[PDB]
Amino acid sequence: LSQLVAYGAQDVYLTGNPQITFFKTVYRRYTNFAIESIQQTINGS
Amino acid sequence: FTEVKLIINGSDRFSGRPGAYFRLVQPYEHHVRVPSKSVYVYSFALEDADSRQPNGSANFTRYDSVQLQLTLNENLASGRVQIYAPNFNILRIAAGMGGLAF
Amino acid sequence: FTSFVLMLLFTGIILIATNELTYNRPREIQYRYLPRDLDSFIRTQEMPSAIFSSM
Amino acid sequence: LYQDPVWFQDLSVIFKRPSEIIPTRDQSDSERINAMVRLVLYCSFAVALIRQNYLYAILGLAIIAIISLAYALGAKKTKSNEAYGNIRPYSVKRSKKSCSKSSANNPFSNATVGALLDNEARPPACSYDDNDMASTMRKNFNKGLFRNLDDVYEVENSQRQFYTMPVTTAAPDLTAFGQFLYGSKGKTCKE
Amino acid sequence: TIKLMIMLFSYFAAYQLGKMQERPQSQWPKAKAGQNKYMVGDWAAWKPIYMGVLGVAVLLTLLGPGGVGGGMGGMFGGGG
Amino acid sequence: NVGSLELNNLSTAEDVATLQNQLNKLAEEKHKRSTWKGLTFRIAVQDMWEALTGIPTDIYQNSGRVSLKELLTRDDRLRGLGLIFFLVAVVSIFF
Numbered sequence: 001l002s003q004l005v006a007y008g009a010q011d012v013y014l015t016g017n018p019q020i021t022f023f024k025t026v027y028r029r030y031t032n033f034a035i036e037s038i039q040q041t042i043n044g045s
Numbered sequence: 046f047t048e049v050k051l052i053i054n055g056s057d058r059f060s061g062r063p064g065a066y067f068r069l070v071q072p073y074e075h076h077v078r079v080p081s082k083s084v085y086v087y088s089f090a091l092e093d094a095d096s097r098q099p100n101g102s103a104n105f106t107r108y109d110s111v112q113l114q115l116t117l118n119e120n121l122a123s124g125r126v127q128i129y130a131p132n133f134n135i136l137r138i139a140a141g142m143g144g145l146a147f
Numbered sequence: 148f149t150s151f152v153l154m155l156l157f158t159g160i161i162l163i164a165t166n167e168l169t170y171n172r173p174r175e176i177q178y179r180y181l182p183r184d185l186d187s188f189i190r191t192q193e194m195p196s197a198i199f200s201s202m
Numbered sequence: 203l204y205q206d207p208v209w210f211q212d213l214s215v216i217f218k219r220p221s222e223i224i225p226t227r228d229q230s231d232s233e234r235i236n237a238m239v240r241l242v243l244y245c246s247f248a249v250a251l252i253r254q255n256y257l258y259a260i261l262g263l264a265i266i267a268i269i270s271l272a273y274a275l276g277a278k279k280t281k282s283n284e285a286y287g288n289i290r291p292y293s294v295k296r297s298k299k300s301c302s303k304s305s306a307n308n309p310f311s312n313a314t315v316g317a318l319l320d321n322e323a324r325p326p327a328c329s330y331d332d333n334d335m336a337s338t339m340r341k342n343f344n345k346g347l348f349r350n351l352d353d354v355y356e357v358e359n360s361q362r363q364f365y366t367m368p369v370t371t372a373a374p375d376l377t378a379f380g381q382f383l384y385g386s387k388g389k390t391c392k393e
Numbered sequence: 394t395i396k397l398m399i400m401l402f403s404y405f406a407a408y409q410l411g412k413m414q415e416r417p418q419s420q421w422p423k424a425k426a427g428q429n430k431y432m433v434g435d436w437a438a439w440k441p442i443y444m445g446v447l448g449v450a451v452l453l454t455l456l457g458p459g460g461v462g463g464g465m466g467g468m469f470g471g472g473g
Numbered sequence: 474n475v476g477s478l479e480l481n482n483l484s485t486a487e488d489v490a491t492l493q494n495q496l497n498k499l500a501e502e503k504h505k506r507s508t509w510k511g512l513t514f515r516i517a518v519q520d521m522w523e524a525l526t527g528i529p530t531d532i533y534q535n536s537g538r539v540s541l542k543e544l545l546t547r548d549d550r551l552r553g554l555g556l557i558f559f560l561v562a563v564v565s566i567f568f
Binding site: 001002003004005006007008011015 | 490
């Protein structure tokens with residue numbers, strides 16, 4: 001997290017900051033994941 | 046003390062002198078105040094109470110043997126003779142590190 | 148005999164002076180500031196998508 | 203962990219410290235090249251001294267450059283000299299054993315998931331003291347991490363917890379462990 | 394004497410089967426029972442080396458971006 | 474849209490400096506081009522300085538225990554051996 005950071009042209013030249021209307025939500029596209037719940041074994045009475 | 050003498054490496058540093066000299070005269074001449082109490086002193090430097098400037102010193106690191114002779118009065122109780130010797134050193138500070146040089 | 152090696156070094160050292168230019172090979176890449184709006188957008192965004200990149 | 207004696211190649215000035223070796227035997231390829239260098243240097247210098255024309259030494263240096271350049275450029279990267287298990291049949295001559303050097307993504311070469319990434323067969327991370335990889339490991343650990351400057355024997359940022367696991371390959375190499383506990387003893391009494 | 398001198402080296406080149414070399418792996422140390430030898434570092438002596446090591450560590454920290462913070466603030470600079 | 478991180482600039486720079494990174498690396502580019510241009514064929518009088526740097530330092534390189542040939546000669550020293558051209562010219566004038 002402490003390393004110097006910079007962007008290439010592909011994240012600057014080929015893009016930009018779109019203007020967003022309060023009332024037009026643009027939702028973020030995200031990674032694919034799933035959530036499970038399982039029991040762990042307890043060692044000790 | 047009726048008489049006081051300092052001996053350095055077997056030799057007299059000064060001729061022995063009466064205790065009164067060391068109690069009354071020496072601090073008159075060399076320090077800020079005369080104690081008026083029976084405190085005996087001797088300086089190796091001229092005119093001070095630190096005074097924020099050395100006015101001489103005796104380098105005892107070269108004295109292999111130092112003795113001081115006291116001729117005591119005849120009405121003393123057995124006990125302590127507390128001897129102090131304020132001296133100089135070099136405080137040295139560098140790159141975050143402290144310490145005192147000999 | 149001696150003049151032979153003298154001329155050999157005479158030409159060889161000029162050859163070396165020609166050769167030496169090849170040694171230093173640094174990479175050049177420049178730095179520039181983000182556009183203000185794009186900079187604000189990047190600073191505002193909360194998720195990074197891809198985790199990290201080394202170049 | 204497998205260890206080998208020290209050698210070096212003709213660069214620097216090693217060609218004089220273990221001097222008076224001329225021709226190769228049971229030596230590493232770098233040592234064999236060094237021995238050839240010694241042969242050529244002594245031969246050409248002696249020839250130049252016998253016939254004082256001052257050019258046989260030049261030809262000796264030129265052929266030294268030829269041999270060294272050939273060795274430097276023509277090396278074949280197709281080496282898999284990795285020792286594990288019961289057999290090391292690839293070569294029996296002196297050579298440097300393969301090591302998986304510490305990397306930025308894997309500072310301690312613990313083979314957590316790096317083995318499944320690209321290597322498949324990953325050479326063991328060799329000893330802590332073999333090739334100065336201790337300094338590289340410390341540098342890689344102290345990448346992007348700030349110290350409080352109250353510990354010059356740094357333990358404050360938890361060096362101790364991190365370490366190299368005993369095995370750094372996909373398999374524990376159980377055959378070597380068994381041979382360690384139970385020697386082959388060659389031809390035994392029952393045979 | 395060319396043919397001869399080269400062969401003299403050839404004869405010697407063949408002969409010196411073997412390879413002497415610098416000690417490999419790691420060097421080792423011997424421990425007195427605790428009488429009769431001087432410690433490697435004076436016990437009073439050991440603390441100073443601690444202290445000596447610090448000089449280097451602090452000097453590295455005179456350039457913040459080059460390493461690890463100090464006891465306050467921070468400092469900037471660079472090379473050339 | 475993506476985070477790319479540059480680890481170092483030939484000397485590890487922690488992600489604290491902001492403009493020092495630009496100043497340092499601009500100085501790096503300037504030094505690299507200065508060395509390239511003063512190290513190419515086009516030289517005016519700098520041969521004397523290169524030779525005077527070459528001889529004592531070339532000798533001293535062997536005063537260390539070792540010195541790699543990639544560094545005994547290629548550390549701005551190769552044309553530093555250009556003084557041999559001067560000496561052979563001198564002797565050819567003589568001889």
